[PDB]
Ligand binder design. Sequence first.
Ligand SMILES: NC[C@H]1O[C@H](O[C@H]2[C@H](O)[C@@H](O[C@H]3O[C@H](CO)[C@@H](O)[C@H](N)[C@H]3O)[C@H](N)C[C@@H]2N)[C@H](N)[C@@H](O)[C@@H]1O
Ligand SMILES: Nc1ncnc2c1ncn2[C@@H]1O[C@H](CSCC[C@H](N)C(=O)O)[C@@H](O)[C@H]1O
Length: 321
Amino acid sequence: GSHMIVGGSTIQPERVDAAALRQLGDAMRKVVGSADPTPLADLLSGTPVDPDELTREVGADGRQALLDSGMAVDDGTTFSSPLRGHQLHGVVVLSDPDVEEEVQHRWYVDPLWEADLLIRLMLRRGGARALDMGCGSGVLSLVLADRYESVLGVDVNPRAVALSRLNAALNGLTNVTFREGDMFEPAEGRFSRIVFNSPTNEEGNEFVDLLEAGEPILETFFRNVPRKLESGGIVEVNLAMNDYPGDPFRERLADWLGLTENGLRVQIFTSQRRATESGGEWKRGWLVVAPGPVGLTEVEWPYHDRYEEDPDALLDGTDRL
Ligand SMILES: NC[C@H]1O[C@H](O[C@H]2[C@H](O)[C@@H](O[C@H]3O[C@H](CO)[C@@H](O)[C@H](N)[C@H]3O)[C@H](N)C[C@@H]2N)[C@H](N)[C@@H](O)[C@@H]1O
Ligand SMILES: Nc1ncnc2c1ncn2[C@@H]1O[C@H](CSCC[C@H](N)C(=O)O)[C@@H](O)[C@H]1O
């Protein structure tokens, strides 16, 4: 048909018993991320697999649970999966494979481009109630679930809600809730923790799709953050920022947050930057709202480079700062 097919597959965990899902999840903990792929690990890496082999490893029920949830598809001979398995930070996560923009369905889910990294940037603290805006595959929500009494994930992509729910089910996590909706609209009450791996990269002000929504989505997030955040609470945001001549991002951010009016402390840790036509600058960085002296600070923290060199060096970094 048309070429934008990756990310349109039907995902339906509610079609399977939660016990079957937690068993499949247990099979996945054994083999996903381990070299010399078993049948199940190779299925979750995108290779066609004989169901005979797959059956010996997860059972006949496990084999049906893969088909009924949509984790696998029966060609005729073999089984294939439209998703990819990951195992990190104590959790097992499925998501779409990493592929080029041009073959991305409008419901394509973040293939975990920065999730492992952002999880290492996250303050290791815990508390009452966490929110994960744009939760995608649910990966950030599943991690936070370990140190928060409850976690709410929100995404406007109904495929990502289904996938998030599947992944929670695979890990047998019971304190995680996902809702479909537009930004804060289904997030009732306040939160002691808010995390946002934002849909922003090189699109500037332009809305391109659900993964690159333009600066307007950041303005909405940050304008509404003060009424969503508990006193003493913590916001963390992965984002792309654009500085234009006489028009720096950090100032637009201050207005959105009502920085002085709300008494907020905001630090931006900038990791990558490149000059643009307009004479201004593109940045990628990590923004944290946390308690302390009212104001906005910006530092250079090349955490993308230090990640390539030694990932565990990033643990408790924002705490040290
Ligand atoms: N190497 C090939 C890949 O290159 C691009 O991948 C980008 C990611 O997009 C970007 O992720 C960030 O930008 C997304 C929007 O682009 C946001 O939604 C997301 N929250 C945010 O973390 C990473 N930082 C860097 C990576 N090079 C393409 N997009 C992708 O199709 C392609 O396979
Ligand atoms: N208006 C909106 N309301 C809620 N989520 C939105 C949104 N617009 C885009 N998003 C979501 O924001 C997510 C950004 S990608 C990050 C996904 C996941 N948290 C991870 O780290 O891997 C996407 O899933 C996208 O669907």
